PDB file of C-alpha atoms and ligand atoms in Angstrom:
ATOM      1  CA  UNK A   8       0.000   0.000   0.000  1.00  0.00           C
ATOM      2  CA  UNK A   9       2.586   2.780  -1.190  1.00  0.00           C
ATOM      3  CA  UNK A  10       1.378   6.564  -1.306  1.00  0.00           C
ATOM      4  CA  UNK A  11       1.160   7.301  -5.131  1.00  0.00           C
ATOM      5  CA  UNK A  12       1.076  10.919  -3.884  1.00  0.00           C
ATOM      6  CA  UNK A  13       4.829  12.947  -4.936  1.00  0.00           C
ATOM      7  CA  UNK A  14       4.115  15.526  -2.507  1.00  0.00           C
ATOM      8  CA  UNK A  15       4.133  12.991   0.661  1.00  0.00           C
ATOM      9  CA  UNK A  16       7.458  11.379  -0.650  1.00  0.00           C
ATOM     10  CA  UNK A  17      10.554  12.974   1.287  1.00  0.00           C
ATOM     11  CA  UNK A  18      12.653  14.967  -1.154  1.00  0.00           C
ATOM     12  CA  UNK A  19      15.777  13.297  -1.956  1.00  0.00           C
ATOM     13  CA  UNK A  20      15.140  10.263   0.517  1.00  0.00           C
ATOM     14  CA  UNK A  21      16.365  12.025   3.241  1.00  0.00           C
ATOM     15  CA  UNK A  22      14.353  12.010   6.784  1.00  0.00           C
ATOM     16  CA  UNK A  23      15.548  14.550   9.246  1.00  0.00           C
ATOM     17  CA  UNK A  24      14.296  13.323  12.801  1.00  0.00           C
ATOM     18  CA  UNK A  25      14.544  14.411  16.740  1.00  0.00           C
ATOM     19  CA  UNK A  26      14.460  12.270  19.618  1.00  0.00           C
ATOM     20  CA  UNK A  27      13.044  13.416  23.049  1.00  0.00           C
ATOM     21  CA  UNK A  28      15.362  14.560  25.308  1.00  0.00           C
ATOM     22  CA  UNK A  29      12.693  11.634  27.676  1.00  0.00           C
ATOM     23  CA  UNK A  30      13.827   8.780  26.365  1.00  0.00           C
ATOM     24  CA  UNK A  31      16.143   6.342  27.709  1.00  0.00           C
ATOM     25  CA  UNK A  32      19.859   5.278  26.415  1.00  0.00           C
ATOM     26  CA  UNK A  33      17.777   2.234  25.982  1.00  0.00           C
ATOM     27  CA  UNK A  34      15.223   3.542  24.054  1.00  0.00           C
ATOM     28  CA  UNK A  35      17.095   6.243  21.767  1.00  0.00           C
ATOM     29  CA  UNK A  36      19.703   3.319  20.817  1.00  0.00           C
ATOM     30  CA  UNK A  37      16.314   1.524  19.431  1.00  0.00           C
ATOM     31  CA  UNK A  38      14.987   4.109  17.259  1.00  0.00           C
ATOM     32  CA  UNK A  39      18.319   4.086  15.904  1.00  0.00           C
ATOM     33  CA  UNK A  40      18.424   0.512  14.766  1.00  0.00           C
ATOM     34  CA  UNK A  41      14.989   0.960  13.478  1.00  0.00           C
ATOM     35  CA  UNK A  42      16.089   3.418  11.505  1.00  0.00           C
ATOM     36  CA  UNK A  43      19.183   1.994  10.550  1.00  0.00           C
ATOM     37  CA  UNK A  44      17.832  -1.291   9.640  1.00  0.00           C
ATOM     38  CA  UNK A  45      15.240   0.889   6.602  1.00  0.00           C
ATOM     39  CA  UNK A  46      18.767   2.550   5.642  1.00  0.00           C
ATOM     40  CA  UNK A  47      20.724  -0.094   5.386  1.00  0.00           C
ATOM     41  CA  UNK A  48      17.899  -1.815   2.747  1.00  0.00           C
ATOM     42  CA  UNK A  49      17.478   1.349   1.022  1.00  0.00           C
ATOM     43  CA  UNK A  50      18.473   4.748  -0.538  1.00  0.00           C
ATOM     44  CA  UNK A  51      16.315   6.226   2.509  1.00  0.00           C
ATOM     45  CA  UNK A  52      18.702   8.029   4.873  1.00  0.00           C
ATOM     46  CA  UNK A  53      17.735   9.411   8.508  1.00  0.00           C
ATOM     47  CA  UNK A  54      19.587  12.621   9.371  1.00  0.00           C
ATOM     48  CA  UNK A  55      19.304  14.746  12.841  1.00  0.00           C
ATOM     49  CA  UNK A  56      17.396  17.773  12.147  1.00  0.00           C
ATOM     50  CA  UNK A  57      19.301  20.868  11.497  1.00  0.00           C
ATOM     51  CA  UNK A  58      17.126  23.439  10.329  1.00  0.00           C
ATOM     52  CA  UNK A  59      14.142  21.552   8.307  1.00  0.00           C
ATOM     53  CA  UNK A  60      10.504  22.977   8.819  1.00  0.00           C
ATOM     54  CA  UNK A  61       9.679  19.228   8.172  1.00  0.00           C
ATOM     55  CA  UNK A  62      11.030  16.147  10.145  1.00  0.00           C
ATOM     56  CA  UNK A  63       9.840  13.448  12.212  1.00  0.00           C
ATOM     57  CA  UNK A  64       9.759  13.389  16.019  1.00  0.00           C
ATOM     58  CA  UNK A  65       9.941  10.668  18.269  1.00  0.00           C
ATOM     59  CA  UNK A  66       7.530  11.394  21.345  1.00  0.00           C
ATOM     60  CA  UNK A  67       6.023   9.076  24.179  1.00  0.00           C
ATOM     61  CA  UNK A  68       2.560   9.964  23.177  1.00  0.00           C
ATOM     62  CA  UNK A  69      -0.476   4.727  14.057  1.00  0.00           C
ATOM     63  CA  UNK A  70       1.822   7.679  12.411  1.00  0.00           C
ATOM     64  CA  UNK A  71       0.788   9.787   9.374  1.00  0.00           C
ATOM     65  CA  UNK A  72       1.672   8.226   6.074  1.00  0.00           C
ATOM     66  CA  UNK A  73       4.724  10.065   4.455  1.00  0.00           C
ATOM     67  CA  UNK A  74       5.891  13.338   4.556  1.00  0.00           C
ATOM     68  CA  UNK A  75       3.443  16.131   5.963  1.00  0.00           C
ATOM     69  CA  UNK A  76       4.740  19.196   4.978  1.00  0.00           C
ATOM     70  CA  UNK A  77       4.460  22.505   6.914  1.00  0.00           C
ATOM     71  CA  UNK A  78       5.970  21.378   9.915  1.00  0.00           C
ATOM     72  CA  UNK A  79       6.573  18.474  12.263  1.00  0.00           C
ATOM     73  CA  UNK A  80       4.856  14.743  12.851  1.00  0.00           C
ATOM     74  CA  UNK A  81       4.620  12.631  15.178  1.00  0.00           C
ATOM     75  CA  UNK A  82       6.323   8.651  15.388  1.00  0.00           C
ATOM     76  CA  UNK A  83       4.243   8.411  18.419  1.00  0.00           C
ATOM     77  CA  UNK A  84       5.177   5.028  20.770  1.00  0.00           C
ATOM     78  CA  UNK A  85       3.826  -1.749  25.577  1.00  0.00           C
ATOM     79  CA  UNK A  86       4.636  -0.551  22.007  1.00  0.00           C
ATOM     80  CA  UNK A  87       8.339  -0.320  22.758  1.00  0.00           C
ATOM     81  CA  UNK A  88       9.871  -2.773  20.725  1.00  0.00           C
ATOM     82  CA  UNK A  89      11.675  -2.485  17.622  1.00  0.00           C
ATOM     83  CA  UNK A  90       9.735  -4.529  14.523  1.00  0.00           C
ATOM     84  CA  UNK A  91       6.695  -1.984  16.297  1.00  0.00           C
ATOM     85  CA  UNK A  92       8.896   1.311  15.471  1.00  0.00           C
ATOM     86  CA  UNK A  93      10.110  -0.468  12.053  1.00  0.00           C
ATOM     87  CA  UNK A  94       6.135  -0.523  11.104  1.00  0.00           C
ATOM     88  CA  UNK A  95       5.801   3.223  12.335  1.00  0.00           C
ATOM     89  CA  UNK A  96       8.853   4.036  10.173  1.00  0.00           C
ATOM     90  CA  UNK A  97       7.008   2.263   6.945  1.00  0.00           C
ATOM     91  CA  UNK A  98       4.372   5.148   7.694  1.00  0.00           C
ATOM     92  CA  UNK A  99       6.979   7.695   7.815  1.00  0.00           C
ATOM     93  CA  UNK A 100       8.585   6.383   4.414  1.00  0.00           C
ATOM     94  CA  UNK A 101       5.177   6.329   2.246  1.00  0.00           C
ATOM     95  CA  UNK A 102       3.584   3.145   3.472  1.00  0.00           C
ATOM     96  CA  UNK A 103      -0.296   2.553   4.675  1.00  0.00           C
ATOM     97  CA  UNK A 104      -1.352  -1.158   6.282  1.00  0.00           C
ATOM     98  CA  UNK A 105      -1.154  -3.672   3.757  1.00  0.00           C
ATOM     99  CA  UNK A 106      -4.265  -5.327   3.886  1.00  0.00           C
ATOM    100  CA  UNK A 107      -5.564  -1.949   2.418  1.00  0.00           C
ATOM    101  CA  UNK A 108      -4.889  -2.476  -0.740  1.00  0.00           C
ATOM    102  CA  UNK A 109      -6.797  -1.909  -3.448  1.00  0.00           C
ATOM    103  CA  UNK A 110      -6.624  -5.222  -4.992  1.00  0.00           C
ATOM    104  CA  UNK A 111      -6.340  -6.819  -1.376  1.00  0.00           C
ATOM    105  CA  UNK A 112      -9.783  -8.502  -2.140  1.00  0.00           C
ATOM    106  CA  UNK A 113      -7.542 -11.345  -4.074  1.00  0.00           C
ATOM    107  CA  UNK A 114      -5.587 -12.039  -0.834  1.00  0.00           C
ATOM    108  CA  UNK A 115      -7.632 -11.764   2.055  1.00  0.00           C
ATOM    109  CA  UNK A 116     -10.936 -11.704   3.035  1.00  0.00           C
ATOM    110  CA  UNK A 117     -12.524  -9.400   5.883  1.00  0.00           C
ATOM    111  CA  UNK A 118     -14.532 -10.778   8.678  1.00  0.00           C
ATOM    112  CA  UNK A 119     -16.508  -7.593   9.219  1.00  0.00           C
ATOM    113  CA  UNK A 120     -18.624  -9.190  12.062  1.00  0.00           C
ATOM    114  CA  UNK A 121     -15.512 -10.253  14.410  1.00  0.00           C
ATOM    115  CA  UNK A 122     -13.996  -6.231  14.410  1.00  0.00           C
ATOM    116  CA  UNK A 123     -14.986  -4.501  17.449  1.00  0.00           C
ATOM    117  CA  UNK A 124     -17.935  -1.964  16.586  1.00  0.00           C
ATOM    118  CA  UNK A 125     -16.308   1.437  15.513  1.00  0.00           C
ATOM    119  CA  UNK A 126     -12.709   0.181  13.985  1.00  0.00           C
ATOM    120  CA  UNK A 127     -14.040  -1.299  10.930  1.00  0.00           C
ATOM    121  CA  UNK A 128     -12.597   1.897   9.361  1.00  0.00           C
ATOM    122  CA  UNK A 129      -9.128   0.628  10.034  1.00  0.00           C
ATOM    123  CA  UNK A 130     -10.292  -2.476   7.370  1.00  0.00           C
ATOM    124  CA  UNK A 131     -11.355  -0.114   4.525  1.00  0.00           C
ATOM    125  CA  UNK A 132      -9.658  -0.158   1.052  1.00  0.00           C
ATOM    126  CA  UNK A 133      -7.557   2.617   0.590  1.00  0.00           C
ATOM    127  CA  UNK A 134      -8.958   4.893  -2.853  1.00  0.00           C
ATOM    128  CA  UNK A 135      -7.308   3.795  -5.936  1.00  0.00           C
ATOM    129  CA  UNK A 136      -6.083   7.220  -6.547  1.00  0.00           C
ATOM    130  CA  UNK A 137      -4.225   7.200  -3.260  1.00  0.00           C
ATOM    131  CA  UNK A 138      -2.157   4.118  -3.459  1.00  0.00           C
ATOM    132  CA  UNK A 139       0.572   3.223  -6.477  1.00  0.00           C
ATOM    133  CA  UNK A 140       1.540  -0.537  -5.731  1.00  0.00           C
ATOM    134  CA  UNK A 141       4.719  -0.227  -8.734  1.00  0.00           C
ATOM    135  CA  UNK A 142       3.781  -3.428 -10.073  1.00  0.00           C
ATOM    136  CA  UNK A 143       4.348  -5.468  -6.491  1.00  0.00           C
ATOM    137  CA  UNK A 144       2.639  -8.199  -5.225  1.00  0.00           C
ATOM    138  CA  UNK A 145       0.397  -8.213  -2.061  1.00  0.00           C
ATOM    139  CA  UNK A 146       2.952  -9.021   0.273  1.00  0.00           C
ATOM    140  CA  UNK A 147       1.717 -11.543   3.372  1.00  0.00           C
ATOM    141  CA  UNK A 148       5.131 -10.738   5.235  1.00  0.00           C
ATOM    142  CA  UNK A 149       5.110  -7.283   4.838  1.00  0.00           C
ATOM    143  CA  UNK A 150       5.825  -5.620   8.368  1.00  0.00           C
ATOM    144  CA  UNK A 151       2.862  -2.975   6.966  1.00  0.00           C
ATOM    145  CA  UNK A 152       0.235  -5.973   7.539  1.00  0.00           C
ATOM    146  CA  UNK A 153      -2.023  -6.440  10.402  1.00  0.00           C
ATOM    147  CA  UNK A 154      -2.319  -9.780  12.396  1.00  0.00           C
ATOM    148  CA  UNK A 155      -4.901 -12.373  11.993  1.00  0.00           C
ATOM    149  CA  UNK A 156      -7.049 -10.677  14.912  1.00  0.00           C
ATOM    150  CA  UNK A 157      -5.960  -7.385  14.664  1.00  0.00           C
ATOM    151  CA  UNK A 158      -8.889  -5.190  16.437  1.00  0.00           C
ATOM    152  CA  UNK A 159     -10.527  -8.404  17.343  1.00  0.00           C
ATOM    153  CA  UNK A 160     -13.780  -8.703  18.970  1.00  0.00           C
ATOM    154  CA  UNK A 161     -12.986 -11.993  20.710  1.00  0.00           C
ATOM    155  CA  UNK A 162     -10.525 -15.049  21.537  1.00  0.00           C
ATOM    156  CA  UNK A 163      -9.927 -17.001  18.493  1.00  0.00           C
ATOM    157  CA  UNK A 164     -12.209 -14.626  16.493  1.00  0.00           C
ATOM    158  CA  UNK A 165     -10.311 -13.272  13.095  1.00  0.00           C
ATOM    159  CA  UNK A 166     -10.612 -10.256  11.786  1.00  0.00           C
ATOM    160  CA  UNK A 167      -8.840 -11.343   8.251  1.00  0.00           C
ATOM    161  CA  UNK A 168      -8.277 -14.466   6.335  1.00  0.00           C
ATOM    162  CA  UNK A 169      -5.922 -14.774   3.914  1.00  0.00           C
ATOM    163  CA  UNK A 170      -6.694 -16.482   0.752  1.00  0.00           C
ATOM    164  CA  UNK A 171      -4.767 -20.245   0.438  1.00  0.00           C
ATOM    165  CA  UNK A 172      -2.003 -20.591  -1.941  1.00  0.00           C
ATOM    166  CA  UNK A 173      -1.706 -23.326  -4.993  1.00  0.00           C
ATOM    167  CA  UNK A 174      -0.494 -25.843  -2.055  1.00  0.00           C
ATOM    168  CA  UNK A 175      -3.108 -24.979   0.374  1.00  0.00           C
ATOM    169  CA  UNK A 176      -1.561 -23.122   2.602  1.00  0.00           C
ATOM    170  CA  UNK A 177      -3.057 -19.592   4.010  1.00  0.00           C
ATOM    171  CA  UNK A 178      -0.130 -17.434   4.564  1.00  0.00           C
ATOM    172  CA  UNK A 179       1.266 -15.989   8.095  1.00  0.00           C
ATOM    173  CA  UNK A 180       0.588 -12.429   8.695  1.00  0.00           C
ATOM    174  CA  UNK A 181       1.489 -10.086  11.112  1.00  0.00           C
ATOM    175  CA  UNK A 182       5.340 -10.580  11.577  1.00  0.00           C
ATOM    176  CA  UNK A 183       7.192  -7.498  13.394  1.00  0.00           C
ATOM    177  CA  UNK A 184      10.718  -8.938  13.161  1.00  0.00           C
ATOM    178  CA  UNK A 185      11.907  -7.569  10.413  1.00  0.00           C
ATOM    179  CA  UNK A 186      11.582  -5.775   6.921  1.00  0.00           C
ATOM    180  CA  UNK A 187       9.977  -8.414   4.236  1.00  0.00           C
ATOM    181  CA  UNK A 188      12.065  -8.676   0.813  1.00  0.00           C
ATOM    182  CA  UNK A 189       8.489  -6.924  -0.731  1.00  0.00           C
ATOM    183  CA  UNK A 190       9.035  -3.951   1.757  1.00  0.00           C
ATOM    184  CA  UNK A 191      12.289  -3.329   0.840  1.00  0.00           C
ATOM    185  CA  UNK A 192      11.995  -4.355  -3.147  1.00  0.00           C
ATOM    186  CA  UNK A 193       8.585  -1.938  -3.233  1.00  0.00           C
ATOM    187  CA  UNK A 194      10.470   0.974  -0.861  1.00  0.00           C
ATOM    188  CA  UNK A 195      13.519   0.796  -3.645  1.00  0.00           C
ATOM    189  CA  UNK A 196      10.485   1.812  -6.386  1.00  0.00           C
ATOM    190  CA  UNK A 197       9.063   4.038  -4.468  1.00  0.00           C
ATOM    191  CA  UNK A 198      12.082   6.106  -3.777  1.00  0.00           C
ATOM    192  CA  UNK A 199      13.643   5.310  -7.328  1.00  0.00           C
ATOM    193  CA  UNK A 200      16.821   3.973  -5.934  1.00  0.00           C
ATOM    194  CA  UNK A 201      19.955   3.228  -8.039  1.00  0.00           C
ATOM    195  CA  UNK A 202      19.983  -0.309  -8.919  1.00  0.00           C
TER     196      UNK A 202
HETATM  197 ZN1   ZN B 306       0.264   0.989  11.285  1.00  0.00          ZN
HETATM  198 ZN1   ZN B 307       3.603  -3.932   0.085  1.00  0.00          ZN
END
């Protein structure tokens, strides 16, 4: 689910941030690797602000998808944990959930009855003007995708399916480990990195 909007991609792939003077060693040393681990994948670089109207900020308070403009947002983090600020990053960078997809429909199914009354927004489809896939496959692995029972109205009650491959098998979703090879291959289009 990549932005197809130009004017939320960051200008030359470059993401100026601050981190709270609140945080712990701990903590600060995390957003780091989180950050470090999109770099390192990418032609996306994090860079402590200097001067820039625009730039992320790290504050104890999901994040706005891409760049703003006209000032600063929020990577607002239980939710301490790195694969969680690796997903809020993928908002920062361009990315909305997965599973919001346009063409998501031929992947997973909703089970509308099982979301707790007043989140089904968070299963809509994203518009098709607002999303620019660049040719990539629905990604199962992608660290943008929602668990099984994400907003879940119950034990053992999903909130999405997905669809069974050729050999049966419905995929795994919901991983916050790590970047998928789709999250990195589709963040590589989306920034237009050198090959
Ligand atoms: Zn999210
Ligand atoms: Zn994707």
């Amino acid at each position: 689910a990549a932005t197809s909007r130009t004017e939320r991609i960051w200008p030359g792939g470059v993401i100026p941030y601050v981190i709270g003077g609140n945080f712990t060693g701990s903590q600060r040393a995390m957003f780091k690797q989180a950050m470090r681990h999109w770099e390192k994948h990418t032609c996306v670089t994090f860079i402590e602000r200097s001067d820039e109207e625009s730039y992320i900020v790290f504050t104890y308070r999901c994040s706005y998808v891409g760049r703003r403009g006209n000032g600063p947002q929020a990577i607002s983090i239980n939710c301490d944990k790195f694969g969680i600020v690796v997903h809020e990053l993928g908002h920062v960078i361009g990315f909305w959930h997965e599973h919001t997809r346009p063409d998501r429909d031929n992947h997973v199914t909703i089970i509308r009855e099982n979301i707790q009354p007043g989140q089904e927004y968070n299963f809509l489809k994203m518009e098709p003007g607002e999303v620019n896939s660049l040719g990539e496959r629905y990604d199962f692995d992608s660290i943008m995708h929602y668990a099984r029972n994400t907003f879940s109205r119950g034990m053992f009650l999903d909130t999405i399916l997905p669809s069974r491959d050729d050999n049966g098998i419905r995929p795994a979703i919901g991983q916050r480990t790590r970047l998928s090879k789709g999250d990195i291959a589709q963040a590589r289009k989306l920034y237009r990195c050198p090959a």
